[PDB]
Design a protein around this nucleic acid. Structure first.
Ligand SMILES: [Mg+2]
Ligand SMILES: [Zn+2]
Ligand SMILES: [Zn+2]
Ligand SMILES: [Zn+2]
Lengths: 286, 28, 130
RNA sequence: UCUGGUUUCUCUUCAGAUCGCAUAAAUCUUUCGCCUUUUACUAAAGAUUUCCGUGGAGAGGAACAACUCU
RNA sequence: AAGGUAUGUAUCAAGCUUACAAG
């Protein structure tokens, strides 16, 4: 039902060689979601690595901007529901065999024949990004994805192959933590990992820290930039732009709005292209 | 500069002895 | 065709509304994929050079407009000073001597190229996992 | 004195010839014959194919190719 | 050879199917 010319393939699946040789079939396996006969491709990423063929069709990759074999985001290198919750919209797709399943895949293929360049509905909200997902977009990826999976007969100690057992050995997997949207087991741990970062301790008082030592102004931040980034928060009581240290001092009347500034700027408020400098002010008449 | 002045000749007349060697212009 | 037409830059603030990946050029949803006609042999040679020794020359057309470096892990290239796999090397080091029986006379003693080499607590955890 | 090549393997189109010194099966269109209906069928004609094979041609080697036709 | 000993449901394994994507 489907031909192709070249696969989607995020960068960690290609392997560390710029010179890889790759083979193709014409109607290979089926897609592991929609049973559609794509063209399976196979290659060797690296010299200690399994072959990692091709898992879903080009259509089921163009739907969710997903790579071709490891099923991660093509823009980030992240799972699917991390992206869809991080963009707060799911781009629904049915679950059963026909019930709207191959119907909607067929029709979304029929209205994807023109472009072949971008995902079908994610294009509008893949622009308003880079705030909540960019903190976890692991560049320089780990190639343990590509290592060959663990053999039996070392698990049973029987492996007569000796050294030339191509798969692996002495990696016993653990039966406590190992589809396409939800629910996936390590993703819950990763969203707990992002919800539970390492901040500064919240000091024992009643919201007196409306001042904060934010600095690293340099030549990027100006006065109206930071006070219009705080005017959407609310009202000041005293601003200054102290340029001996390249810093700015803002407060709020009844702290709460500047409270989310403390949530926005734990080395995190990224405007004008800079990791801003943040440590804690006085609020102590000092 | 010192031995590269003939080591490049080693690599070149090494590589070119396989660039076009085996009658590229085994089948049956 | 003229150089000035295609080399003329684009006026604008570059449109930073997009992400890095969607602003980047493509034809295929993942990078601009285009045909090529490289020599088979030098492709295979520099491929095997990287596959063995972890360095190769880089393939490009318009990255910096000048590109003549090595890639992968850099320092081992100049440790061997840019030799290849099809070269009788400067030294014959860390070789590994096989024992040979190439008479085809003794029976169960002839190992030609099939010669196996001269070199020839976890199970509690494995039984508790299973 | 100089000129200097049969085998065997793969591709490359052309076949007009008893391409085959013999001879399969199918589809279609009609008439038969058995028939209850349908495939299995019958046995003649017409026109089409498939299949088992062949002929002359370009190229690449390798096989004593250096014995020697010339 | 079909044309007759109906078919249509509800629980219970081998046959066949991939030996894959994976913190
Ligand atoms: Mg009837
Ligand atoms: Zn699919
Ligand atoms: Zn992938
Ligand atoms: Zn093993």
């Amino acid at each position: 039902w489907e031909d192709a010319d070249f696969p989607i393939l995020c960068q960690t699946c290609l392997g560390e060689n710029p010179y890889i040789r790759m083979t193709k079939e014409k109607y290979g396996k089926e897609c592991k979601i929609c049973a559609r006969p794509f063209t399976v491709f196979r290659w060797c990423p690296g010299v200690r690595m399994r072959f990692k063929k091709t898992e879903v069709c080009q259509t089921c990759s163009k739907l969710k901007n997903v790579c071709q074999t490891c099923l991660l985001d093509l823009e980030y290198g992240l799972p699917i529901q991390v992206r869809d919750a991080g963009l707060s919209f799911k781009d629904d797709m049915p679950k059963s065999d026909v019930n709207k399943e191959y119907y909607t895949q067929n029709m979304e293929r029929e209205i994807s024949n023109s472009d072949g360049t971008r995902p079908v509905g994610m294009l509008g909200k893949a622009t308003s990004t880079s705030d909540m997902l960019l903190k976890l977009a692991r560049t320089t990826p780990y190639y343990k994805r590509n290592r060959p999976h663990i053999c039996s007969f070392w698990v049973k100690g029987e492996c007569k192959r000796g050294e030339e057992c191509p798969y692996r050995h002495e990696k016993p997997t653990d039966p406590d933590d190992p589809r396409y949207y939800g629910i996936n087991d390590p993703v819950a741990d990763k969203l707990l990992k992002r919800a539970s970062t390492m901040p500064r301790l919240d000091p024992p008082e009643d919201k007196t820290i409306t001042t904060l030592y934010v600095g690293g102004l340099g030549d990027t931040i100006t006065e109206t930039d930071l006070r219009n980034h705080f005017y959407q928060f609310g009202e000041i009581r005293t601003i200054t732009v102290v340029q001996r240290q390249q810093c700015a001092f803002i407060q709020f009347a009844t702290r709460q709005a500047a409270e989310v500034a403390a949530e926005k700027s734990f080395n995190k408020l990224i405007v004008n292209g800079r990791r801003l400098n943040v440590k804690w002010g006085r609020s102590q008449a000092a | 500069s010192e031995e590269k002045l003939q080591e490049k000749a080693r690599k070149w007349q090494q590589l070119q002895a396989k660039r076009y060697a085996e009658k590229r212009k085994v089948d049956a | 065709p003229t150089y000035e037409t295609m080399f003329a830059p684009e006026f604008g603030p570059e449109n930073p509304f997009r992400t890095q990946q969607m602003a980047a050029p493509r034809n295929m949803l993942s990078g601009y994929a285009e045909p090529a006609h490289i020599n088979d042999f030098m492709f295979e040679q520099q491929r095997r050079t990287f596959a063995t020794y972890g360095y190769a020359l880089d393939p490009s057309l318009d990255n910096h407009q000048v590109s003549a470096k090595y890639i992968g892990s850099v320092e081992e290239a100049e440790k061997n000073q840019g030799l290849t796999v099809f070269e009788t090397g400067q030294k014959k080091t860390e070789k590994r001597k096989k024992f040979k029986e190439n008479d085809a006379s003794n029976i169960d003693g002839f190992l030609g190229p099939w010669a196996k080499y001269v070199d020839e607590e976890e199970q509690k955890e494995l039984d508790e996992i299973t």
